[PDB]
Design a protein around this ligand. Structure first.
Ligand SMILES: Nc1ncnc2c1ncn2[C@@H]1O[C@H](COP(=O)(O)OP(=O)(O)OP(=O)(O)O)[C@@H](O)[C@H]1O
Ligand SMILES: Nc1ncnc2c1ncn2[C@@H]1O[C@H](COP(=O)(O)OP(=O)(O)OP(=O)(O)O)[C@@H](O)[C@H]1O
Ligand SMILES: [Cl-]
Ligand SMILES: [Cl-]
Ligand SMILES: [Mg+2]
Ligand SMILES: [Mg+2]
Lengths: 496, 475
């Protein structure tokens, strides 16, 4: 239900304790009032109580409302937006805009109808309105909230209550943040085992990535902390079960997804790959057992241990890594490679979703990595009658052995891929916004211990890696937790 | 109200309040108890912090109890006692002594406020509510002179200028504006008097004295904005509510006397002598309650001074000691009270007949030498009271004792008067008026024109509704 002891420690502090934060912090408008949820709220509360900024705020709200409205209501909403904010005599008309910006808004028509208008509003709001905000109690309230965000919230704050899964380095428990009662998944990594098997680099890249990236198609890191025996990641709980499980379990006699389900999962995965690729990350571990369903039937990618962050200027990488059967020819051959490898994995995943087997080996056949390698390099993929002509087409485009001919990430987006006929019946606008009804709404045993790890002592280098790994609370998710969970509502009161 | 002016009522950016932060009286009593916005913000803050919830609600309930009606008080005592003093009750005040709970209401309040002045206040200072307070104290200190008031009709005439009824343009609250002509003030040397009136009306806060809100200057006048009193003066009422049967009837006279006393008391407790109590100076409001006014001849007694000298006041109301040349204290005001009550009942002074023209020299001689006689209109209790007050020797005169008029309130005249309900403005009055009836110069004017007085302004901001409007967090 949630713990008295810990709730009582979520309390906005006195102002004098926020003097430190005041300076050593990001004053950035985009960072404070656009990307950080509490930051956003407080900024909008500020604009709401200053009458002059009413017309900007409402346009802002009304644009965000329009971006996620249903296709039915849109034309109507698009008109009411133009009628309220873009006619020189309307009550909430927006002086601060160019003629050229107001003109384009009135005349636009398409996928990103009001994104130039939103950019203009945000640019305006980022000027004086923001400067006034900084000079106001609402900004100070933000600091109180940031102060709280930075208070220690380590192992004591989470209650493991059941086993969700098992990794190479530890179990993954369902757990509750005792203060707010929110449910998370807590992936535990045994410190001695990590050392002995030399999995530190892998552990760090997963945390670095889950930390920095915010996408509804990638599991999100909330907290990182350490216990005496383990490193712990607290992340988005996914109770649905991995895709692979559902491919073989939905029908034992007739395994595989009906195509609309496989296209929905494919679209969601793609959108996850695109968020990674836009941030110069190569996943390198896409495959059915790493795609998780949540309580509603929505998927996200997971297991980022094999991912590589490309540096500034770097467009390619090298390194043998991945699961046999999903690694692209480039990778197998030892060549330099980019994001293409992930699209090759995508195709093998789509394949398996449809056909209940890999493109390169029959169901329940043992094939050794050496042989499975030559298959991937030399074998033409055959497609059984199970596949529609659209799904054959798409896989063929992803299974292209030559990366340069492979479909995928061009011009900083996946928009090319999205127009492929397979997605004919998908509102990408809505998929990305999290609105579409998923196709199948869903509805573990504890093994005990991992074997003893004899003869492993820690050096300072090990301890530093652990303190570095245990970097604490991630702002955006914590702030999200505070809001969804009611704690923001309670503590942000002025006079109840 | 006015858009242009209401528009100027806006809370400032926090950076503009760093001036006030370090140059204001941080005292607890002044900030959170006396000042209405500081009080609201303190309470708002406390309500926010649950640990302090018990203390807040107790304070509130003691004040609600103190202003309830006699019929309800017993049940509010029991509920307060059971709700805050039983050890098992949820809202139990841990902080209080065992010695004070056994004793338990005024003492209790002093204990609760004592506690709220320690940690709770210190936490408040380190909170957003104090900064909001500083915001409101910036707006308070902003310039609000001649331009903000629009005078709309004359209410009366004095010796140094007219007294208009005007309205504050931004809040639409009506006041009275006593305007003094600068040139006239110098030529008649009224400087000291206008100054004394202003400093006194600024510093005292009682429902029975007119309250200064603002104080400013035009090119031609020095202007005092104060509590509007549309009921007219008491003299006017003695001789025009009925010209055939002038005078008041006793319970009415007893009513106003009680109010005058309380006002007199308030001045005396703060070492002030009114020195000019008389019916033409007691004014009525629209509800029918009175307030003393025209404090120009008031003297402020310093620390460690029990008496003063100085011939000042209105002939026939100045007491023997003062006329004689002796030293005197608050007792002179009680002598003027006696005269005042007498005139309220008998439609004539005790030292002259109605319409009898007598001059200062002889009027003096009478005040010193004449035995006051009482017609039948005076009941035995009225008689005894006036006799007490008009006793020519100040030693034998009923007056201010042991820092209070508690002694004088005991007199049989006020047997029908519930004191807390009067002193708390609750009692219905006995008559409700009908709505239908050189360089050293320029430095003095600047120094006179001090500006806005906090308490009444804060009060104005709440009653008028501006506080509710501009103190919002998420509407
Ligand atoms: N967010 C989550 N919600 C629910 N279950 C999860 C979550 N993340 C991982 N799991 C489960 O936890 C276990 C570990 O998965 P994960 O892929 O993170 O481990 P891993 O040790 O990195 O695997 P590998 O060694 O193959 O890289 C699996 O049973 C997986 O299904
Ligand atoms: N608050 C008020 N509300 C309404 N009328 C008032 C108020 N104050 C003064 N007046 C009017 O102005 C008249 C004279 O006021 P007041 O006695 O203060 O002037 P003054 O010049 O100080 O008088 P004096 O000449 O005795 O010093 C009063 O009789 C009354 O009619
Ligand atoms: Cl503010
Ligand atoms: Cl299906
Ligand atoms: Mg891993
Ligand atoms: Mg007068």
């Amino acid at each position: 239900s949630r713990d008295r002891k810990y709730l009582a420690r979520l309390k906005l502090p006195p102002l004098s304790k926020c003097e430190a934060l005041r300076e050593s912090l990001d004053l950035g408008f985009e960072g404070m009032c656009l990307e950080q949820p509490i930051g956003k709220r407080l900024f909008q509360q500020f604009l709401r109580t200053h009458e002059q900024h009413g017309p900007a705020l409402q346009l802002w709200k009304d644009i965000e409302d329009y971006d996620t409205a249903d296709d039915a209501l849109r034309p109507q909403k698009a008109q009411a937006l133009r009628a309220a904010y873009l006619e020189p005599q309307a009550q909430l008309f927006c002086s601060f805009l160019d003629a050229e910006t107001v003109a384009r808004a009135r005349a636009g028509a398409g996928d990103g109808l009001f994104q130039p208008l939103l950019r203009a509003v945000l640019a305006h709001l980022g000027q004086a309105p923001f400067q006034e905000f900084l000079d106001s109690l609402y900004f100070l309230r933000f600091l109180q909230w940031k102060w709280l965000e930075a208070q220690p919230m380590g192992e004591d704050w989470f209650l493991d209550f059941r086993v969700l899964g098992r990794g190479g380095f530890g179990e993954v428990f369902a757990c509750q943040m005792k203060a707010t009662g929110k449910l998370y998944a807590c992936k535990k990594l045994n410190k001695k085992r990590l050392k002995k098997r030399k999995g530190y680099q892998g552990a760090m890249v997963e945390k670095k990535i889950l930390a920095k990236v915010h996408s509804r198609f990638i599991v999100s890191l909330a907290y990182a902390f350490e216990t005496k025996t383990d490193l712990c990641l607290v992340m988005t709980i996914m109770n649905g079960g991995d895709i692979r499980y559902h491919i073989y379990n939905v029908d034992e006699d007739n395994p595989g997804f009906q195509e609309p389900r496989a296209i929905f999962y494919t679209a969601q995965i793609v959108s996850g790959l695109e968020h990674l690729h836009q941030r110069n990350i190569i996943y390198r571990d896409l495959k059915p057992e790493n795609v998780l369903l949540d309580d509603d039937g929505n998927v996200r990618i997971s297991d980022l241990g094999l991912a590589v962050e490309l540096k500034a200027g770097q467009t390619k990488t090298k390194g043998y890594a991945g699961t046999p059967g999903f690694m692209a020819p480039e990778l197998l051959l030892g060549e330099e490679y980019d994001f293409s490898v992930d699209y090759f994995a995508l195709g093998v995943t789509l394949y398996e979703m449809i056909a209940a087997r890999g493109p390169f080996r029959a169901r329940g056949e043992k094939v050794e990595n050496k042989e499975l390698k030559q298959r991937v390099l030399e074998q033409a993929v055959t497609y059984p009658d199970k596949f529609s002509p659209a799904s054959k087409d798409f896989c063929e485009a992803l299974l292209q052995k030559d990366p340069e001919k492979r479909l995928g990430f061009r011009d900083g987006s996946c928009d090319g891929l999205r127009t492929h006929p397979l997605f004919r019946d998908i509102s990408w606008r809505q998929l990305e916004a999290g609105m579409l009804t998923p196709p199948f709404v869903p509805d573990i045993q504890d093994v005990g211990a991992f074997s003893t790890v004899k003869g492993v002592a820690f050096e300072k280098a090990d301890t530093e890696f652990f303190q570095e790994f245990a970097s604490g609370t991630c702002p955006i998710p914590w702030q999200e937790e505070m809001i969804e969970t009611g704690v923001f509502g309670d503590l942000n009161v002025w006079r109840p």
